[model samples]
Target: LMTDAIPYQEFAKLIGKSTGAVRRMIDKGKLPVIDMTDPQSASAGEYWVYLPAWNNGLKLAYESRPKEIRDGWLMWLGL
Candidate 1:
């Protein structure tokens, strides 16, 4: 699941949004989630997002963001 799915933080960077925004969306049930855990405990935080899940919507949303957001270069250009 590590490389198979994009980490939430990395996803946020690709979509041109802050991690906070991404987290809120996830909680709002806007994103797809699947299998996760550690030490075999009930770890909900172990879940992850997959590209297949994004096929219905996420990819389109991704294209809508500014090119800078897509490139994750918003840090250098303060616009």
Candidate 2:
């Protein structure tokens, strides 16, 4: 998942938010998710990529957060 589509449990380990809250962000187009499943090649784990396109959307999401939240979610990652 390229650190982006990491399950809420993993992401929450660093961020101070509930799993549901993080999931909601994903659902609401805050944190972006790429295709993790590989249909062409045989794969086991979900390996999504957090490319530029994903970050473009993610950047917009930061606008809604407070400074601290924004920093933790965006600036920390240099997004």
Candidate 3:
């Protein structure tokens, strides 16, 4: 079955952030991520984040960037 969970690196690039930042967010419980292997648990290759959550967070983050930068990033992402 297909899943909405994507690698943290992929998510980072999608939101114009570094992998480290994404990891930090997960570590701080600031992001919603999926555990593919042990869905009941929160460990073991738990490096995938939900796309919907990432997109929501990205939209909020975009608001914090300068208008020019936000516009450019959005245009590049075809958003």
Compute each candidate's TM-score over C-alphas.
0.57, 0.39, 0.51
lDDT by residue for model 1 (22-42), tens: 888888988886656666686
Write candidate 3's Cα lDDT for 1-79 as tens digits. Answer: 1767788888799889999998998889988887657667765775888877767788888788888866776777687
Q: What lDDT is reached at residue 5 by model 3?
A: 79
After superposition on all C-alphas, the RMSD of every candidate to the true structure, in Å, is 8.5, 9.1, 6.6
How far residue 19's Cα lies from its native spot in candidate 1, in Å, is 0.7
Backbone clashes in model 3, listed as residue pairs: none
Error of 2 at 41 (Å): 13
Candidate 1 to truth, TM = 0.57
Best TM-score among the predictions, by candidate number: 1
Query: How does candidate 3 score on lDDT?
Result: 0.80
Ranking by lDDT: 3, 1, 2
Q: Could you tell me which residue pairs clash in candidate 2?
A: none
- Candidate 2 or 1, higher lDDT: 1
The lDDT values for all models are: 0.75, 0.58, 0.80
* Model number with the top lDDT: 3
